[PDB]
Amino acid sequence: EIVLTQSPATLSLSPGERATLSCRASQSVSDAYLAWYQQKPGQAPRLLIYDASSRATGVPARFSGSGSGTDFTLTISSLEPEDFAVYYCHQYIQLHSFTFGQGTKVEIKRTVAAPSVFIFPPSDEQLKSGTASVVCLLNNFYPREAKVQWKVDNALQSGNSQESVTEQDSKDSTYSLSSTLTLSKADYEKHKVYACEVTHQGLSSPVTKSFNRG
């Protein structure tokens, strides 16, 4: 019934900066049956504020809320790297109907950081089974944007690597990334030099990590 509208969808800010998130209700939820939750990646929501403005135990002072009727706000007065999270409002005026806002994603800006690059060769254990996974790690970088290209012998390989990025580190706001090249044992054994070449704005010229099949 009561529709909560959160704004903005994403807030990209640096530490120190103020994050003010808005939550609008389709009808009055009173002197506030309104709450805010923080949801960090891989975790349950956590209560920050209830009754529009009441701070829950353990929630740091830099969090506060205000509003009544249909207009509410949550403020992180001075943003901290640990505040990377999605934030949700929740109205509970009639206990038979709980609705939530669509959330606001708070992302943390930082200084440019170079990826430390590593290459992993398949284990012998994996090879006995007839598959070769080759893993290239781009560690602790910023911003998100990176180019990982696989070089077998020296020809550009395509179409059989998957990437996965971690979420911004709670402590230093960096990303890490893995590129995994998966080949058949036969396909793997076709070539010799397996190379990972990483292009990032934290590096003056693209770094390459490689090993020779052995």
């Binding site: 049956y33 349950a44 939530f100 430390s116 992993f120 996965s164």
Partner: protein, 211 residues
């Protein structure tokens, strides 16, 4: 604390029944709600129960498709959703609220329900071998469904540990690597084990990573 049951696969058409176990027993005064989260989606309220009365409200969306119950004896509550379709794949959280208020002040850890006509497979674990700091890790390949937990040295090492989000491979099995940066000097002395647990298939495997 509220302790939820392990993650499960269910086939389309069936029904799931998730447990939420309360603290001590004093969930007398408090309600228990079930909120679910579809992947990359918002929070969605399914229903609540005030246990001392065994009385349940539900969202209109989940009318007589959901049934929520409490067990007065051993202080656990249950959400049971039926006619599971692809759309019902979600993390199912239980949470505690006070009847005179309504804020969800404490939440369970979450229960992943994968609605799929696909069988449970445990993963294989392979070492990512060490290259003044050194990367080492573990590849956790070919499992179903999610999730898998990965710890290092039974919990003794947490610093510098990146465990990646799983990918879904073209085979329809998940894979993931968990890596760690340690001092180069500690390699040929400090021993490193990755502790993998895929609960849907009772698979605990501990793997040493050497160069």
């Amino acid at each position: 604390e509220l302790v939820q049951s392990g993650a499960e696969v269910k086939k389309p058409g069936s029904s799931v029944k998730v447990s939420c176990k309360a603290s001590g027993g004093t969930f007398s005064s408090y309600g228990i709600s079930w909120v679910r989260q579809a992947p990359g989606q918002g929070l969605e309220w399914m229903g609540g129960i005030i246990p001392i009365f065994g009385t349940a409200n539900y969202a209109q969306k989940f009318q007589g498709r959901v049934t929520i119950t409490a067990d007065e004896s051993t202080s656990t509550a249950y959400m049971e959703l039926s006619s599971l379709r692809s759309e019902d794949t979600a993390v199912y959280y239980c949470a505690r609220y006070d009847g005179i208020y309504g804020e969800l002040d404490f939440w369970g850890q979450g229960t992943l329900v994968t609605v799929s006509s696909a069988s449970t497979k445990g993963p294989s674990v392979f070492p990512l071998a060490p290259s003044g700091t050194a990367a080492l890790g573990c590849l956790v390949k070919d499992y179903f469904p999610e999730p898998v937990t990965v710890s290092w040295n039974s919990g003794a090492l947490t610093s510098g540990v990146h465990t990646f989000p799983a990918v879904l491979q073209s085979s329809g099995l998940y894979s993931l690597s968990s890596v760690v940066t340690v001092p180069s000097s500690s390699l040929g002395t400090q021993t490193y084990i990755c502790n993998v647990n895929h609960k849907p298939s009772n698979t605990k495997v501990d793997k040493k990573v050497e160069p």
